[PDB]
Amino acid sequence: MAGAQDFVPHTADLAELAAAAGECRGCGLYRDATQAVFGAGGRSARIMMIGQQPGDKEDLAGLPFVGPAGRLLDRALEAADIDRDALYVTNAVKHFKFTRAAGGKRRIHKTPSRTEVVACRPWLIAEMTSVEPDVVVLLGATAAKALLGNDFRVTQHRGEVLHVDDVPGDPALVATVHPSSLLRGPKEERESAFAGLVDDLRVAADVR
Ligand code: SF4
């Protein structure tokens, strides 16, 4: 009766799950978005990565992390010697929540409410039980709070391997900055922040 749960089929197959998510009406976000954007990768992945939501490029590509934030993430993964093809990557919510400004060059993402995050979380649980990752990288506040609690502060736990007792399979969790946050700002601050993202990715990759 709650959120996305009745839309989630009783299967761990990622292709089946993604097809079903295309029909989800578990919150209001399906209405204005072009399509649901499920995760990408396969069930043998040892590392799962979760962002906030599909953005403007992802909403139309049908794949996660294809825009500028995704290209920065690719650069950080390469510096961390992680092959993106070996990951399962997804987002805490699966429809793009957005507005447009007059004169704007893109659709502008808006923050999912906690209500929307909780509504969509059945998909994330299905992905986690399907993939059985050894470690989950939480990119940004929305994703981290989805699993660690609404009060959790990414800025206060950088570099730490976390484990919480009601996440399925008890994977390690590593919460880090979202790559979109490193696209703008002073040069020295962007460079320090990028190095910190590489460090956190390496923490995740060194898990068992
Ligand atoms: S954001 Fe998630 S819960 Fe909401 S309609 Fe889309 S897939 Fe369903």
TrEMBL record:
Family annotation (Gene3D superfamilies): Uracil-DNA glycosylase-like domain
NCBIfam families with a match to the protein in the record: UDG_fam4, UDG_fam_dom
Assigned keywords, A-Z: 4Fe-4S, DNA damage, DNA repair, Hydrolase, Iron, Iron-sulfur, Metal-binding
One of the record's GO molecular function terms: metal ion binding
InterPro entries given in the database record: UDG_Type-4/5, Ura-DNA_glyco_family4, Uracil-DNA_glycosylase-like, Uracil-DNA_glycosylase-like_sf
GO biological process, one term: DNA repair
Protein name, as recorded: Type-4 uracil-DNA glycosylase
Ranges for domain Uracil-DNA glycosylase-like: 38-202
Pfam family, one: UDG
PANTHER family: TYPE-4 URACIL-DNA GLYCOSYLASE, TYPE-5 URACIL-DNA GLYCOSYLASE
Family that this chain belongs to: Belongs to the uracil-DNA glycosylase (UDG) superfamily. Type 4 (UDGa) family.
Binding site residues for [4Fe-4S] cluster: 24, 27, 95, 120
